[PDB]
């Protein structure tokens, strides 16, 4: 997705992980907030969501709870108290195009911040002065969205980086998106401790 229209795909009733992060598609660049990644073979959540998009690569510093860099604050303000982790890896080889893949967009501005998990696809010319904007397209009002410039000539910060912010949460409804429990052999006759699935 374009981050201005970011997907929020639910993940549900299946085995969650982070070990897969070290195999055929290991992350270039990654962060967690409020939790250690090691627990993602242990914990379980009611809901998980792939908040999925691309960024201008420098937004790795912006996409943080509490960090309030305006483009995020107009495209996807993460909850400023959220606890969790985020894919954000370089995708220049993929998403940049020779003439330039000028189809990944961000809201440049809005009349307010986004709230946590808000999405705004108001598309009228944003007012900044007076009178209804009515296509004035450059004085009182300006069109609020802009494409990223994704091209191989882009310096690394400007390059595309592919993002899945991983929202996950717990409710009165029981947890089901759970990390894999481990396994051990069927030793017999010896006196042992055991955990047969509880």
């Amino acid at each position: 997705a374009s981050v201005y229209a970011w997907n929020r795909k639910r993940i549900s009733n299946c085995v969650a992980d982070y070990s897969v992060l070290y195999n055929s598609a290991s992350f270039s660049t990654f962060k967690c907030y409020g939790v250690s990644p090691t627990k993602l073979n242990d914990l379980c959540f009611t809901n998980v969501y792939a908040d999925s998009f691309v960024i201008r690569g420098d937004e790795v510093r912006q996409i943080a709870p509490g960090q309030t860099g305006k483009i995020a604050d107009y495209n996807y303000k993460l909850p400023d108290d959220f606890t969790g982790c985020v894919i954000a890896w370089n995708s220049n080889n993929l998403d940049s195009k020779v003439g330039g893949n000028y189809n990944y967009l961000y809201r440049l501005f809005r009349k307010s911040n986004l709230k946590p998990f808000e999405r705004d696809i108001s598309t009228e010319i944003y007012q900044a002065g007076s009178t209804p904007c009515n296509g004035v397209e450059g004085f009182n009002c300006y069109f609020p969205l802009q494409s990223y410039g994704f091209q191989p000539t882009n310096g690394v910060g400007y390059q595309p980086y592919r993002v899945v912010v991983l929202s996950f949460e717990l409710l009165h409804a029981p947890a089901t998106v759970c990390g894999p429990k481990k396994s051990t052999n069927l030793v017999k006759n010896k006196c042992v401790n055991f955990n047969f699935n509880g």
Epitope: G100, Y102, L105, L108, F109, I125, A128, G129, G135, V136, E137, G138, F139, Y142, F143, L145, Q146, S147, G149, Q151
Partner: antibody, heavy 123, light 112 residues
């Protein structure tokens, strides 16, 4: 290298319509509005209009509306201007003109014009 | 739309020496909303669409023709030319983009 290169020759005697085009280079096409300007044997510089390419939005000078429209392809990083009818004396050095998006918030200095453009004697 | 009277018709500067072009205008180019002016000068080149002369009725273009300098407010366009090179033969323009539609100025030519 940054450039924006026009359609080549158009030459015909009057009364048919025309479409004129100009293709960017170097720069992110959405990073600039394209504007279209033309020569007059009198005044020289004359402005017809602007494309917000990312929106596709347009605005136009009162002199031209009924004939004129202008449009773009962002995927082809290329801009178009189209006119219902050319007079002999609507022969001009037509310009595609380059205009940066509002990198300055409030955009007034962003609305300096890169009127370097390129001119073509569409005839 | 704003009328943009340029004076002289032809800057007759014998080169080297300093000079000025002026363009009186009827109507506003003070950007007292946002500071500065929405006002630039432009010079149409011999064979080529114009290079920007001056931002904001005062501060120079990125092309460094420091032979030129500018000032004004409200509806004064003053162009002042501190030095003349023989290449400065050309047609100099005030223009408005404070409002849409645009207008181009009457032009001033340069010669000896």
């Amino acid at each position: 290298q940054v450039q924006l290169v026009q359609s080549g020759a158009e030459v015909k005697k009057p009364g048919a319509s025309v479409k004129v085009s100009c293709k960017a280079s170097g720069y992110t096409f959405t990073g600039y509005y394209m504007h279209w300007v033309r020569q007059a044997p009198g005044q020289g510089l004359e402005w017809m209009g602007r494309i917000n390419p990312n929106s596709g939005g347009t605005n136009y000078a009162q002199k031209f509306q009924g004939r004129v429209t202008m449009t773009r392809d962002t995927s082809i990083s290329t801009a178009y201007m189209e006119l219902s009818r050319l007079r002999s004396d609507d022969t001009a050095v037509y310009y595609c003109a380059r205009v940066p998006y509002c990198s300055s918030t409030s955009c007034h200095r962003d609305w300096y014009f890169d009127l370097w453009g390129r001119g073509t004697l569409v005839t | 739309d704003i009328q943009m009277t340029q004076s002289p018709l032809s800057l007759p500067v014998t080169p080297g020496e300093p000079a000025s072009i002026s363009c009186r205008s009827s109507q506003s180019l003070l950007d007292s909303d946002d500071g500065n002016t929405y006002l630039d000068w432009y010079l149409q080149k011999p064979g080529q669409s114009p290079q920007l002369l001056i931002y904001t009725l005062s501060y120079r273009a990125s092309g460094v023709p420091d032979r030129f300098s500018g000032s004004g407010s409200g509806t004064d366009f003053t162009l002042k030319i501190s030095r003349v090179e023989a290449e400065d033969v050309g047609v100099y323009y005030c223009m408005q983009r404070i409002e849409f539609p645009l207008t181009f100025g009457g032009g001033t030519k340069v010669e000896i």
